[PDB]
Amino acid sequence: MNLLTTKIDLDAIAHNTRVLKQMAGPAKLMAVVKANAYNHGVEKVAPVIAAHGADAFGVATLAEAMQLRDIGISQEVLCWIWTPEQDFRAAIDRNIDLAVISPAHAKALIETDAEHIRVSIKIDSGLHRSGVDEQEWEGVFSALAAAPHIEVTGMFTHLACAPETDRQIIAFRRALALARKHGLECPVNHVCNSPAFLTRSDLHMEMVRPGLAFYGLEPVAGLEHGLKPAMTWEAKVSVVKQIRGFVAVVPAGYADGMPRHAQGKFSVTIDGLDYPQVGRVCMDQFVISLGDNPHGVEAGAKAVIFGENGHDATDFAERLDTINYEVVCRPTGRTVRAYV
């Protein structure tokens, strides 16, 4: 028996997958499962998402993409954070699509002697982060077009989460036209992350790549989509102490993902009732006040930090002055992952 765990509801994930598949329509559905499926356990999550419609998967690193192939994912897989200094050839060998994020990346790929290399051009559409920018488009498209063994499956841009969006699309379309003018068909393109996907059907293109929504969380406040949250972070009270007040100790500290800054900003839920966190969050635990403990909370009681039978990830996120993306990624350390 574990005192600290995250409950991962796989059925909720399948549901979310079905809801996203219906919403995508004719567009392909790429499931973004980087960061170990947003901390939900990609080894279990990805197969469920695959079994319910996902046309492809998107991850950040070479290692994550390779892990997907390891568990048996046979769908198209895209990786966008790697450098020519790494063994990217190992990914190519595993049928992993690689994003061209800079001229140097394009160069390393063209100079790679492999039969057929699938690549997707990451376009810097204005954020000035990663990706090939306007001044480099000409050279890169020309170089990739001249490479026999390279197949440019398309291009994509990451609508940084923002007006801003439409300005990015204009630049992206300028790049796509320039690419095709160079002989690059760019058959499958995508720009939609969860927020854009759930609000801009005009930007579906040939493929959409939402991440957050698969885990049942809403990207924009005020919007309903019938999603089912999949993660619940909960601990079992280790000790109930009487000071006629009482406090309870819950076996979770900053070493487990509970920020020290969360002090005095939230409550956990025991049997559906809230109890405010009090005092300093320590390395292995934090304390909550039971008041006169009228409901008779005892050691062993289940305390929901966020999730089922408690406050959802979004509420907890706002209490912590952050976003739900970060809260689901927080549970770590002694926290054990349990499915459904």
User: Which segments are annotated as binding site for substrate?
Assistant: 129, 283
What burial letters (b/e) apply to 195-205, b meaning 16+ CB within 10 Å? bbbbebeebbb
User: Would you count residue 193 as binding ligand PLP (CB under 6 A)?
Assistant: yes
- For 164, residues 6+ apart whose C-beta sits below 8 A from its C-beta are 126
Taken as a whole, the chain contains a residue count of 340
Q: Which of 212, 237, 248, 262 binds ligand PLP (CB under 6 A)?
A: 212
Binding site partner of 154, from a second copy, ligand PLP, none, Cβ cut-off 5-8 A by kind = none
How far apart are alpha carbons 275 and 262 in whole angstroms? Answer: 14
> Among the options 7, 21, 28, 34, which is catalytic?
34
Three-class DSSP category at 260: helix
Q: Is 21 an annotated catalytic residue?
A: no
CB 108 within 8 A of CB 71: no
Amino acid at 261: H
Cβ atoms of 300 and 248 within 8 Å: the answer is: no
Nearest by Cα to 249 from 273, 292, 278: 278
> Tokens 């980087």 label which residue?
34
| Interface with a second copy, residue 221, by CB under 8 A | no
Instruction: For residue 112, state whether it binds a second copy (rule: CB under 8 A).
Output: no
- Pair of tokens at residue 59: 């991850």
Stretch that binds a second copy, among 96-104, 145-153, 182-190, 214-222 (CB under 8 A): 96-104
Q: Among 41, 131, 210, 216, indicate the residue that binds ligand PLP (CB under 6 A).
A: 210
Q: Does 105 bind ligand PLP (CB under 6 A)?
A: no
Choose from ligand PLP, a second copy, none: what does 321 bind? Cβ within 5-8 Å by kind: a second copy
Q: How far apart are CA 118 and CA 84, in angstroms?
A: 16
Q: Is 158 in the site for ligand PLP (CB under 6 A)?
A: yes
In the complex, least distance from residue 25 CB atom to a second copy, rounded to whole angstroms: 27
**Binding residues for a second copy (CB under 8 A):** 1-3, 34-36, 38-39, 60-61, 63-64, 81-87, 101-102, 104, 124, 128-131, 133, 160, 236, 238-239, 241-243, 247, 249, 251, 254-256, 259-261, 280, 283-285, 287, 299-300, 321-323, 325-326, 329, 332-334
Q: Which residues are catalytic?
A: 34
